[PDB]
Amino acid sequence: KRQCKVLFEYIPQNEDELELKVGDIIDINEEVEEGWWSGTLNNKLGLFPSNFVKELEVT
């Protein structure tokens, strides 16, 4: 898997976004655009801000 850890809380600003809590581990799918990744958290697929996370070593 490719994964990241949430560094800062993020309240979704839009309906297609994930809510982020510090220390959440997200399974990364792809980059939609600079700054914005899709991934899965607690069985939801959504978009999240990439500068709120730290990518982890693959493995």
Binding site: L7, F8, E9, Y10, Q13, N14, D16, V32, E33, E34, G35, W36, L47, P49, S50, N51, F52, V53, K54
Partner: peptide, 14 residues
């Protein structure tokens, strides 16, 4: 990269 708790502008919706 430095992570900072400011989200980038979005252009692609979904």
């Amino acid at each position: 990269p430095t992570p900072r708790p400011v989200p980038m502008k979005r252009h692609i919706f979904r």
